[PDB]
Design a protein around this motif. Structure first.
Motif, mmCIF file in Angstrom:
data_model
loop_
_atom_site.group_PDB
_atom_site.id
_atom_site.type_symbol
_atom_site.label_atom_id
_atom_site.label_comp_id
_atom_site.label_asym_id
_atom_site.label_seq_id
_atom_site.Cartn_x
_atom_site.Cartn_y
_atom_site.Cartn_z
ATOM 1 N N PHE A 73 42.935 25.272 26.791
ATOM 2 C CA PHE A 73 41.647 25.226 26.173
ATOM 3 C C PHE A 73 40.812 25.263 27.287
ATOM 4 C CE2 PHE A 73 37.904 22.638 24.950
ATOM 5 C CZ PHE A 73 37.280 23.503 23.874
ATOM 6 N N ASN A 74 41.065 24.360 28.132
ATOM 7 C CA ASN A 74 39.986 24.407 29.481
ATOM 8 C C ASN A 74 40.171 25.724 30.182
ATOM 9 O OD1 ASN A 74 38.503 23.640 31.447
ATOM 10 N ND2 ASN A 74 39.639 21.832 32.170
ATOM 11 N N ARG A 75 41.370 26.117 30.588
ATOM 12 C CA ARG A 75 41.547 27.273 31.474
ATOM 13 C C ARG A 75 40.908 28.428 30.682
ATOM 14 N NH1 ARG A 75 46.870 25.589 31.783
ATOM 15 N NH2 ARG A 75 47.042 27.133 30.125
ATOM 16 N N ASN A 76 41.007 28.485 29.435
ATOM 17 C CA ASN A 76 40.430 29.652 28.469
ATOM 18 C C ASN A 76 38.845 29.980 29.013
ATOM 19 O OD1 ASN A 76 40.629 31.901 26.417
ATOM 20 N ND2 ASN A 76 39.138 30.444 25.222
ATOM 21 N N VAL A 77 37.942 29.138 29.466
ATOM 22 C CA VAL A 77 36.802 29.475 29.699
ATOM 23 C C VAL A 77 36.737 30.576 31.048
ATOM 24 C CG1 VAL A 77 36.281 27.463 31.694
ATOM 25 C CG2 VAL A 77 34.423 28.359 30.207
ATOM 26 N N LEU A 78 37.833 30.370 31.853
ATOM 27 C CA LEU A 78 38.106 31.497 32.879
ATOM 28 C C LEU A 78 38.312 32.706 32.430
ATOM 29 C CD1 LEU A 78 39.967 29.499 35.667
ATOM 30 C CD2 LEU A 78 37.495 29.628 35.395
ATOM 31 N N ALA A 79 39.118 32.837 31.181
ATOM 32 C CA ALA A 79 39.522 34.176 30.434
ATOM 33 C C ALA A 79 38.204 34.972 29.971
ATOM 34 C CB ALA A 79 40.482 33.955 29.263
ATOM 35 N N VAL A 80 37.408 33.714 29.344
ATOM 36 C CA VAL A 80 36.062 34.246 28.696
ATOM 37 C C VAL A 80 35.119 34.947 29.961
ATOM 38 C CG1 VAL A 80 33.826 33.302 27.575
ATOM 39 C CG2 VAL A 80 36.074 32.701 26.709
ATOM 40 N N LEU A 132 32.195 39.068 31.790
ATOM 41 C CA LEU A 132 31.281 39.345 32.991
ATOM 42 C C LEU A 132 32.239 40.015 34.004
ATOM 43 C CD1 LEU A 132 29.303 35.816 33.461
ATOM 44 C CD2 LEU A 132 28.945 37.990 32.016
ATOM 45 N N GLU A 133 33.167 40.454 33.759
ATOM 46 C CA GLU A 133 34.179 41.319 34.634
ATOM 47 C C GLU A 133 34.488 40.462 35.813
ATOM 48 O OE1 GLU A 133 32.480 45.185 35.400
ATOM 49 O OE2 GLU A 133 32.952 46.004 33.606
ATOM 50 N N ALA A 134 34.865 39.290 35.560
ATOM 51 C CA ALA A 134 35.303 38.478 36.893
ATOM 52 C C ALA A 134 36.757 38.794 37.035
ATOM 53 C CB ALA A 134 35.124 36.897 36.460
ATOM 54 N N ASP A 135 37.290 38.223 38.076
ATOM 55 C CA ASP A 135 38.716 38.221 38.316
ATOM 56 C C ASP A 135 39.388 36.838 38.871
ATOM 57 O OD1 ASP A 135 38.631 39.608 41.964
ATOM 58 O OD2 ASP A 135 37.769 37.968 40.887
ATOM 59 N N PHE A 136 39.075 35.852 38.116
ATOM 60 C CA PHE A 136 39.638 34.444 38.138
ATOM 61 C C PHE A 136 41.223 34.709 37.887
ATOM 62 C CE2 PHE A 136 35.554 32.648 37.300
ATOM 63 C CZ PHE A 136 35.515 31.812 38.037
ATOM 64 N N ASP A 137 41.963 34.282 38.927
ATOM 65 C CA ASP A 137 43.344 33.937 38.654
ATOM 66 C C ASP A 137 43.594 32.933 37.718
ATOM 67 O OD1 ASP A 137 46.243 34.057 40.871
ATOM 68 O OD2 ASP A 137 46.207 34.024 38.755
ATOM 69 N N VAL A 138 43.643 33.008 36.572
ATOM 70 C CA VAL A 138 43.518 32.239 35.445
ATOM 71 C C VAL A 138 44.701 30.737 35.669
ATOM 72 C CG1 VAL A 138 43.714 31.437 33.113
ATOM 73 C CG2 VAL A 138 42.236 33.272 33.799
ATOM 74 N N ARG A 142 39.167 33.607 46.077
ATOM 75 C CA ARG A 142 37.726 34.195 46.151
ATOM 76 C C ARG A 142 37.710 35.089 44.949
ATOM 77 N NH1 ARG A 142 37.440 35.891 51.484
ATOM 78 N NH2 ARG A 142 35.327 34.886 51.990
ATOM 79 N N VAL A 143 36.666 34.667 44.148
ATOM 80 C CA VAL A 143 36.426 35.143 42.830
ATOM 81 C C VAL A 143 35.055 36.090 42.715
ATOM 82 C CG1 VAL A 143 36.197 34.843 40.293
ATOM 83 C CG2 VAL A 143 37.478 33.335 41.826
ATOM 84 N N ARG A 144 35.343 37.481 42.275
ATOM 85 C CA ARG A 144 34.097 38.201 42.161
ATOM 86 C C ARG A 144 33.685 38.409 40.607
ATOM 87 N NH1 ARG A 144 29.769 40.523 44.855
ATOM 88 N NH2 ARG A 144 29.294 42.746 44.300
#
Ligand SMILES: O=C(N[C@@H](Cc1c[nH]cn1)C(=O)O)C1CC=CC1
Length: 321
Positions: A216-223, A228-234, A261-263
Motif C-alpha cells: 500500500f505504501n509503495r503504491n504511492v510511487l506507482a501512482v 506524472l511520468e516518473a521513473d521511481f524504481d518501486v 535518481r528519479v526524474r
C-alpha cells in the motif's frame, strides 16, 4: 427519496493537486508526500485488505464501539441528518443510519468526499437501502468546501477511523476550527481517534507480515510514476513503519535501497535519494483520551461522550456545538 450530487471540484483538481504536492514534497528535507495519494483504485483495494488484517486492530475496535453505542449516539445527538466526512461505503455508515432510522428521525444523508464517482455509487446504494431518506452527496475538500454541506435540521457530522490522525497538530486544530465554524448549535461531531498503546503493537499494525501495508505504501510511487511520468524504481524502496515516541505518532516511510535518481517528467524535476534515505509518506498520530477532549474544546466544541472498546485500543468522542 431523492438523490443529489453537487460537485465543487474541477475535472483537473486532483491532477493539479498531485502536481503541486509532489513538486513541493520531493524538495523538502526530509522528503515527504501527503497520504491522500495512496487511494487510487489499487490503493483502495489494498486498504480494504488492510482493514481485515488481524494486526490492524483500529477497524474492528471502532466497529465494536459502534455496534454497542450507535443507539446512544442517535439518542444523545437527536440528529435527523447524518453528514459523513468520507465516502459512505462502510458498514459503519449503515450502523449510524440504522440507529437514526430506528428512532424515526433519519431524514437526510450527506456523504462528503473528493471522488464524485464513489459518491454517486454510495448515493444510489443508500437510496435503494433507505426509503424516505434524501441523499445530498457533496464532492469537495476540507480546505474549501465545508460551507457547501447542506444546512438545516440537526446534523451529526462523522469523521471515523482515526483519519484525523493524518493531520499534525497545527493543521488538525485548523481543521477542527473550520469544521466547528460550519456547525450550528445543537449539531454534533462523532470523532474516531486511535489511542496511544504499546509501541510494538502500533508498529505491527502498520507492517503486517504478509506485506499488504508495504504494498500500500509503495503504491504511492506507482501512482506518481503513472500520473506524472516518473521513473521511481518501486522495488528499490523499502516500507518502514516507525513509532515516533516524542510526538506519539506512527510514521510510514519509504527507504531507498542504494542511491536513486528519479526524474518526474510532468514536473521537469530531478531529485536524488541517498542510499538509505527515507521519505515520509504518512503520519498517523495517536491520542490520549483527555487530550482529544481538550482539542475539541479548543475548536469550540464540547465533548459529551467518550467511549473505548473493551481493550482501550480505540476511542470515539461525541461532541456538541
Ligand atoms: O484511513 C486513514 N487512516 C488510517 C490509514 C492506515 C491503515 N493502515 C495503514 N494506514 C490509519 O491511520 O490507521 C484516513 C486518512 C485518509 C483517508 C482516511
Amino acid at each position: 427519496g431523492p438523490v443529489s450530487v453537487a460537485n465543487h471540484l474541477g475535472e483537473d483538481a486532483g491532477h493539479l493537486a498531485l502536481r503541486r504536492d509532489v513538486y513541493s514534497g520531493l524538495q523538502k528535507t526530509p522528503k515527504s508526500l501527503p497520504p491522500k495519494w495512496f487511494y487510487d483504485t489499487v490503493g483502495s483495494e489494498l486498504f480494504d485488505q488492510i482493514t481485515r488484517l488481524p494486526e490492524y486492530y483500529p477497524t474492528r475496535a471502532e466497529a465494536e464501539i459502534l455496534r454497542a453505542r450507535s443507539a446512544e449516539v442517535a439518542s444523545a445527538c437527536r440528529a435527523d441528518t447524518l453528514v459523513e466526512l468520507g465516502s459512505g461505503t462502510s458498514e459503519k455508515t449503515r450502523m449510524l443510519l440504522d440507529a437514526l432510522r430506528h428512532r424515526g428521525s433519519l431524514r437526510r444523508f450527506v456523504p462528503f468526499d473528493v471522488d464524485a464517482s464513489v459518491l454517486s455509487a454510495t448515493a444510489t446504494a443508500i437510496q435503494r437501502e433507505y426509503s424516505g431518506v434524501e441523499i445530498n452527496a457533496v464532492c469537495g475538500d476540507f480546505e474549501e468546501h465545508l460551507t457547501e454541506i447542506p444546512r438545516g435540521g440537526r446534523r451529526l457530522f462523522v469523521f471515523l477511523g482515526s483519519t484525523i490522525g493524518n493531520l499534525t497538530p497545527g493543521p488538525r486544530a485548523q481543521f477542527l476550527t473550520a469544521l466547528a465554524g460550519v456547525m450550528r448549535p445543537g449539531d454534533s461531531l462523532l470523532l474516531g481517534t486511535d489511542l496511544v498503546k504499546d509501541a510494538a503493537r502500533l508498529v505491527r499494525a502498520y507492517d503486517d507480515p504478509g506485506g499488504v501495508t508495504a504494498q500500500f505504501n509503495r503504491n504511492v510511487l506507482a501512482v506518481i510514476n503513472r500520473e506524472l511520468e516518473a521513473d521511481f524504481d518501486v522495488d528499490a524502496f523499502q516500507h518502514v513503519a516507525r513509532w515516533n515516541s516524542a510526538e506519539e505518532r506512527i510514521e510510514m516511510w519509504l527507504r531507498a535501497d542504494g542511491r536513486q535518481r528519479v526524474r518526474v517528467g510532468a514536473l521537469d524535476l530531478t531529485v536524488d535519494f541517498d542510499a538509505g534515505e527515507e521519505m515520509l509518506t504518512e503520519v498517523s498520530c495517536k491520542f490520549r483520551p483527555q487530550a482529544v477532549g481538550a482539542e475539541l474544546a479548543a475548536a469550540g466544541l464540547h465533548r459529551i461522550r467518550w467511549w473505548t472498546d473493551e481493550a482501550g485500543d480505540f476511542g470515539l468522542s461525541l461532541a456538541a456545538k
